[PDB]
Design a protein around this ligand. Structure first.
Ligand SMILES: [Cl-]
Ligand SMILES: [Cl-]
Length: 162
């Protein structure tokens, strides 16, 4: 198991534009197209991203290419962020993966606002941080996924995904 398999499980794969759990237009492996309510706007964003006239449908290969870019962007977003980097650097590989999952879903923004959890994480107070992360809109909205990620963080193992 790794970050790619892990997120492909959390996000699934859809080749037609769809609405995510917040009702935003998405496609592929969790790639958000836009926060606007226009499907047109979504279709245009999809075309600009793939570089062709898609008409709201992409291939598997195109999905994967987006996903690759997006995982990459999540990692670099972390490394570039001054509060996150040192947290991420302090951890082992499994837990880093939990962190990337969070950033991928919620954006650099959303995740940097878990300050308190980040401190605990940096101190390696796993059970505590686990309790803290669950007091969040994130856990309340997408609880099954949130649990998977939080277990990973807590245990440092891939059990929740096996
Ligand atoms: Cl893009
Ligand atoms: Cl969920």
């Amino acid at each position: 198991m790794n970050i790619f398999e892990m997120l492909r499980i959390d996000e699934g794969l859809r080749l037609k534009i769809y609405k995510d759990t917040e009702g935003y237009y998405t496609i592929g492996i969790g790639h958000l197209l836009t926060k606007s309510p226009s499907l047109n706007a979504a279709k245009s964003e999809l075309d600009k991203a793939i570089g062709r006239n898609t008409n709201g449908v992409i291939t598997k290969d195109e999905a994967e290419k987006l996903f690759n870019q997006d995982v990459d962007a999540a990692v670099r977003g972390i490394l570039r962020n001054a509060k996150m980097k040192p947290v991420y650097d302090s951890m082992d590989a499994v837990r880093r993966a939990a962190m990337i999952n969070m950033v991928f879903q919620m954006g650099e923004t959303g995740v940097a606002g878990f300050t308190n959890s980040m401190r605990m994480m940096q101190q390696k107070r796993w059970d505590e941080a686990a309790v803290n992360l669950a007091k969040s809109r994130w856990y309340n909205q997408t609880p099954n996924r949130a649990k998977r990620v939080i277990t990973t963080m807590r245990t440092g193992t891939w059990d929740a995904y096996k």
